[PDB]
Amino acid sequence: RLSGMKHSAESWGTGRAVARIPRIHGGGTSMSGAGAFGNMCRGGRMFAPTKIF
């Protein structure tokens, strides 16, 4: 139902030398901060999720 999509992850914003995307919330995991939700992320959504009709 919501494949991929699953950390309490947030976008970190700007000034941080980096593309401004959602990132994984939590430490140690060493998923720690890794890009979140979508398409482009590892294990994420894909673009255009796979519709029922």
Partner: peptide, 18 residues
């Protein structure tokens, strides 16, 4: 039209009855 309300997305919802 399909790009409207309650078509459960990565959200959830919901009123489903195919």
């Amino acid at each position: 039209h399909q790009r409207k309300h309650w078509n459960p997305c990565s959200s959830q919802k919901g009123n489903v009855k195919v």
